[PDB]
């Protein structure tokens, strides 16, 4: 009796939705990030007694991250020089250095500053960047010129994994979960909210993701559970295994005129030839794979687990690809994954050979190519491995077989936007109460 309609504003209730998100970061470097000016400082409050649903495979902000990264790369490559005039027929024999087979690069003609004069030049290229022309094998051509135009990366604009904070707009709240054993789906009984995510580093790599975060408990294995026929299984390490890489030779940059644009070739290689390579702590890798197998055979309880190297595909998936400095690597990982397990502290080091190439197809897409200018001198690099991008083979009939993959770049950032979720606040709500309004 005497219960009347009443309305409340500022109510704590929300509904899930999708919306635009803001780029945020610290003071901008290099005079992947383009958003200025901002100074974020997020604060996290535990929503006591709040049970909320989550899903990593369905949320939209991963797609926003993907589009933002692609657009930023496009804007970075927009002012840089196009390498169209280089498409002419190269005449190559390449017998100068001690090792001719390793690089196998050419001499070609180019129109100089005066458009009526053509000048002969020559430069060094890896034959991964060059494809033989039909007929006489001395003729050669750039790999991607018959499919697309190649843009040289601007040398001063050296983008890198700068951390990025993704800030919600007004009226939306980025939720978060820190349940110690959350597998990417189902409710979280331990929820919180923030303005801005942590600093996500837009790293690009294949067969495993590095410079990542680390889980709370032991190694976490994340997968889609609509069907056993999964595309990719993400494994997140709780204990980083350090990886080191180097390019010992001393390379010599050289400039070729194109107006004021200059094309940066590899003029000469200084120092005796040594193939690029990397190092891994053998005992750590052994223990990590053993722990991963022990965790993984919970899901698949009555079968052996065997690790074997990838099969087929481009260099981006047949080998571990990444970049350190202004160079790209492609390291043969066959020795690492060749293991098997029964169904029932840096003592030694593994070494893996590696190859580097300059003309990079834009990882997600073909028909648009990047050319990396050569980094002079010698390079060393160190990074922290933090997860594996596995993918299983079906139809094996009582023997599981997980082999590395992950050519699709989106899976990398679906692991680091793993916690978060965005909701829309519904501040207005009604209820019954005792009332009167004067008349």
């Amino acid at each position: 009796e005497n219960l009347w309609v009443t309305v409340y504003y500022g109510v704590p209730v929300w509904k899930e939705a999708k919306t635009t998100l803001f780029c945020a970061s610290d003071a901008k470097a290099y005079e992947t990030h383009a958003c200025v000016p901002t100074d974020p400082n997020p604060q996290e409050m535990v929503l006591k007694n709040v049970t909320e649903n989550f899903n990593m495979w369905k949320n939209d902000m991963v797609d926003q991250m993907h589009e933002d990264v692609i657009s930023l790369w496009d804007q970075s490559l927009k002012p840089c020089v196009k390498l169209t005039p280089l498409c002419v027929t190269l005449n190559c024999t390449n017998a100068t250095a001690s090792n001719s087979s390793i690089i196998e690069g050419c001499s070609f003609n180019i129109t100089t500053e005066l458009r009526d004069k053509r000048e002969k030049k020559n430069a060094l290229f890896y034959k991964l960047d060059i494809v033989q022309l039909d007929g006489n094998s001395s003729q050669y051509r750039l790999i991607n010129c018959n499919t697309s135009v190649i843009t040289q990366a601007c040398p001063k604009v050296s983008f890198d994994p700068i951390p990025i904070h993704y800030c919600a707009p007004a009226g939306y709240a980025i939720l978060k979960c820190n349940n110690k054993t959350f597998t990417g789906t189902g409710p979280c009984n331990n929820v919180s909210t923030v303005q801005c995510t942590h600093g996500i580093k837009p790293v690009v790599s294949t067969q495993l993701l590095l410079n990542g975060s680390l889980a709370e408990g032991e190694i976490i294995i994340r997968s889609e559970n609509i069907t056993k026929n999964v595309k990719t299984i993400i494994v997140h390490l709780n204990e980083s295994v350090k990886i080191e890489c180097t390019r010992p030779n001393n390379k010599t940059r050289t400039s070729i005129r194109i107006p004021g644009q200059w094309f940066y070739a590899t003029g000469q290689v200084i120092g005796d030839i040594r193939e690029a390579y990397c190092n891994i702590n053998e005992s750590k890798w052994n223990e990590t794979l053993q722990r991963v197998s022990k965790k993984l055979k919970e899901y698949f309880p009555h079968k052996n687990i065997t690790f074997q190297p990838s099969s087929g595909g481009d260099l981006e998936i047949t080998t571990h690809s990444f970049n350190c400095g202004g160079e790209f690597f492609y390291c043969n990982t066959s020795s690492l994954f060749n293991r098997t397990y029964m169904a029932n502290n840096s003592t030694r080091t593994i070494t893996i050979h590696c190859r580097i190439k300059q003309i990079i197809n834009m990882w997600q897409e073909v028909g648009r190519a990047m050319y990396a200018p050569p980094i002079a001198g010698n390079i060393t690099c160190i990074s922290n491995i933090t997860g594996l991008l596995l993918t299983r083979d079906g139809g094996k009939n009582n023997t599981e077989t997980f082999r590395p993959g992950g050519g699709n770049m989106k899976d990398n950032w679906r692991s680091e936007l793993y916690k978060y979720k965005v909701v829309k606040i519904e501040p207005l709500g009604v209820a019954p109460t005792r009332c009167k309004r004067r008349v």
Partner: nanobody, 113 residues
Framework: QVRLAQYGGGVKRLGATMTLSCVASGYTFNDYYIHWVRQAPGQGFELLGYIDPANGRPDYAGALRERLSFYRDKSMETLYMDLRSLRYDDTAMYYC???????????????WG
């Protein structure tokens, strides 16, 4: 709209290598996995393997891993498969079929070639 044309066929001599082909058309080439199923006469359908068109990752049935080989050509939106050392019981009609792949899993074929 979408059409998966095919070429190659006829008679292939015993023990010789053979190479079919496929051509995509009215859809985004990277977003849909491709499979290769075959039907011998007097048998139900069976799957050989599937090839991811974007990165080119293949995967084969257990009994035919040595003989098969899948590869594509992104610029032409073309796919292939080679079956080395044909045996007599390879007599069959080989369909290429699209797959409706979700964000993290694979599901029913829709558009057969």
């Amino acid at each position: 709209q979408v059409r998966l044309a095919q070429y190659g066929g006829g008679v292939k001599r015993l023990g010789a290598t053979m190479t079919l082909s496929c051509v995509a058309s009215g859809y985004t080439f990277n977003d849909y996995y491709i499979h290769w199923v075959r039907q011998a006469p007097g048998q139900g359908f069976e799957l050989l393997g599937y090839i991811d068109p974007a990165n080119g990752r293949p995967d084969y049935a257990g009994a035919l891993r040595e003989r098969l080989s899948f590869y594509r050509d992104k610029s032409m939106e073309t796919l292939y498969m080679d079956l080395r050392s044909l045996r007599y019981d390879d007599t069959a009609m080989y369909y290429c079929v699209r797959n409706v792949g979700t964000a993290g899993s694979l599901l029913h074929y829709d558009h057969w070639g």
